[PDB]
C-alpha cells in the first residue's frame, strides 16, 4: 500500500471519447456527426420539442387542471415515521421536530405505508382507515 | 499542460520517409508525397503477395509444357496422365526437374503416357 500501488476498481475509469483524432479511433473526420446538416454544424440542433415545424405535442394537446396551493402544505406520513418522534405523541408540530414533514406543512395525514410497533397517540391529524387500525392494533389513541 | 508536437511529429514523418528511400523526387524527400507512395506500395505488395503465387504457377506451367512438348506430350495430357498415375508432384517441382533433370522428366512423361494408354 504505497502511492504507486493504488489502482482504481476495474470498470470505474472509462477512457473518454476524443473526436477528430484520425482514422483508427473511429471518431475521425466528421467525429460521429455524419455529413452536412444542421446537426453536423457547431451549435447545431433544433430546440427541445421542435418536431420539424409540425405542431408539436406539448402544444397539439390541451392544457388541463390547476395547481392547488393546499397540496403544497399537506404531507403524507408513513407508520414507520410514528416511532421517529420524541414522546410517543404524534402532533403536526413534533413531526416537524423529527424532520418528517416540512416546516410549512399545516395538514398531515398518516397512511398505511410501513408498520408501527408501538403505542402511539396521534392528535390533530387525519388518519386513513387502514392506518387507523394499525395504530389501534398497537396501543393506539387517535384523538380528533 | 501545454504539449509541443515537434518530437513526435518528426518521428512520424521520419518513419514514412525512411520507408520511401529509393523513390524518385518528392517521393523520397517530401512527407505529403512520400506517405502516399508508401501506402500505395503497401497496397501493391499486399496485391503482389497474391499475384506472385499466380505468376510463379504461370511460369512453372509454361516450363512444364515446353519440356513435356519436347518429350512428346502437351501439358494438358501430361497432367492428366500424372493424375491417372496418382503422381502428386506439384508444378513447382516438375518445372525444376524439367530444367535441371531432363531424364527424370522423361521418366515422368513416360509414366503419364503409360497411364493414358
Amino acid at each position: 500500500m504505497r502511492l504507486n500501488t493504488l489502482s482504481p476498481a476495474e470498470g470505474s475509469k472509462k477512457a473518454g471519447k476524443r473526436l477528430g483524432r484520425g482514422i483508427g479511433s473511429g471518431l475521425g473526420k466528421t467525429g460521429g456527426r455524419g455529413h452536412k446538416g444542421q446537426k453536423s454544424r457547431s451549435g447545431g440542433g433544433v430546440r427541445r420539442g421542435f418536431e420539424g415545424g409540425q405542431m408539436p405535442l406539448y402544444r397539439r394537446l390541451p392544457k388541463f387542471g390547476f395547481t392547488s396551493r393546499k397540496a403544497a402544505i399537506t404531507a403524507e406520513i408513513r407508520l414507520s415515521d410514528l416511532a421517529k418522534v420524541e414522546g410517543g405523541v404524534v402532533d403536526l408540530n413534533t413531526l416537524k421536530a423529527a424532520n418528517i414533514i416540512g416546516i410549512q406543512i399545516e395538514f398531515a395525514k398518516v397512511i398505511l405505508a410501513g408498520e408501527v410497533t408501538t403505542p402511539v397517540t396521534v392528535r390533530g391529524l387525519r388518519v386513513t382507515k387502514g392506518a387507523r387500525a394499525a395504530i389501534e392494533a398497537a396501543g393506539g389513541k387517535i384523538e380528533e | 499542460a501545454r504539449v509541443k508536437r515537434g518530437v513526435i511529429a518528426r518521428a512520424r514523418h521520419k518513419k514514412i520517409l525512411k520507408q520511401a528511400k529509393g523513390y524518385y523526387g518528392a517521393r523520397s524527400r517530401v512527407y505529403r508525397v512520400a506517405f502516399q507512395a508508401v501506402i500505395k506500395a503497401g497496397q501493391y505488395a499486399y496485391r503482389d503477395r497474391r499475384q506472385r503465387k499466380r505468376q510463379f504457377r504461370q511460369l512453372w506451367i509454361a516450363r512444364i509444357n515446353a519440356a513435356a512438348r519436347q518429350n512428346g506430350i502437351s501439358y494438358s495430357k501430361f497432367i492428366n496422365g500424372l493424375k491417372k498415375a496418382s503422381v502428386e508432384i506439384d508444378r513447382k517441382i516438375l518445372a525444376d526437374i524439367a530444367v535441371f533433370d531432363k531424364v527424370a522428366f522423361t521418366a515422368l512423361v513416360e509414366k503419364a503416357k503409360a497411364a493414358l494408354a
Partner: protein, 201 residues
C-alpha cells in the same frame, strides 16, 4: 484485537473494524486521488479570440483576393490569435462522502497494522527543541521516514522535526490518508490511538 506497544510489555485493545478491516483499494484510491485534486491551485488562463488584444476589423475583404477568407486577426487558426478553448481558473476539488473518507482511513490503518508500518508507543517525548535529540531517538528506534502522530502538539517535538524532511509530526486530528500511505512508518502515541478510534469508530 490488540496492538503491542513497541517500547512496552503492555498492549492496547482497539476496534477490529477500524484497525482490523479489509483493504478496499478502490475507496482508498478515490480518496487519495481526491486529496491530490483538493491540493491543486487551479490558477491559470489563456486568452480566447475575444480576450486577445486587437481589432475586430476584417484583415481583408471577403471576396476578390485569392486569400483564404478571414474575419479576425485573433482567430485561433492564426499565429498570435486566441486559444480555441482557452482555460479559465477552475476548482478541481472533489466531494468525498464523509463515510468514504473515514472508510478509507480505517482501511489504511488496518493495512498499516497488517504491514507492521504502525508503531505504537506510550509517549514520544523530546526534551529540548533540537533535531539532534530527535534524530538520535529515531536512529535508536530504527526509523528514518516516519509520520509521528501525537495526541497533543508538543512545541519541542514539532520544531525538532521541522528540519527533518522525512519526519512529519501531526496531532491526531491532523491525519490525512496520503501521509499515512506516503511515509514508511507511522508512529502513534497510545492516546492518539484513542482519539483516532473515537474519530473513526
Amino acid at each position: 484485537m490488540e496492538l503491542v506497544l513497541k517500547d512496552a510489555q503492555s498492549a492496547l485493545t482497539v476496534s477490529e473494524t477500524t484497525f482490523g478491516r479489509d483493504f478496499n483499494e478502490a475507496l482508498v484510491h478515490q480518496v487519495v486521488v481526491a486529496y491530490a485534486a483538493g491540493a491543486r491551485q487551479g490558477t491559470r488562463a489563456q486568452k480566447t479570440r475575444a480576450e486577445v488584444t486587437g481589432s475586430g476589423k476584417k484583415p481583408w475583404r471577403q471576396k476578390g483576393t485569392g486569400r483564404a477568407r478571414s474575419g479576425s486577426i485573433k482567430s485561433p487558426i492564426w499565429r498570435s490569435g486566441g486559444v480555441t478553448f482557452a482555460a479559465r481558473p477552475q476548482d478541481h476539488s472533489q466531494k468525498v462522502n464523509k463515510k468514504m473518507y473515514r472508510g478509507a482511513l480505517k482501511s489504511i490503518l488496518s493495512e498499516l497494522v497488517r504491514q507492521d508500518r504502525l508503531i505504537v508507543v506510550e509517549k514520544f517525548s523530546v526534551e529540548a527543541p533540537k533535531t539532534k535529540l530527535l534524530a538520535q531517538k529515531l536512529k535508536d528506534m530504527a526509523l528514518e521516514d516516519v509520520l509521528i502522530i501525537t495526541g497533543e502538539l508538543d512545541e519541542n517535538l514539532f520544531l525538532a522535526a521541522r528540519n527533518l524532511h522525512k519526519v512529519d509530526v501531526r496531532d491526531a486530528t491532523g491525519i490525512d490518508p496520503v501521509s499515512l500511505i506516503a511515509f514508511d512508518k507511522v508512529v502513534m502515541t497510545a492516546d492518539a490511538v484513542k482519539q483516532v478510534e473515537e474519530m473513526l469508530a
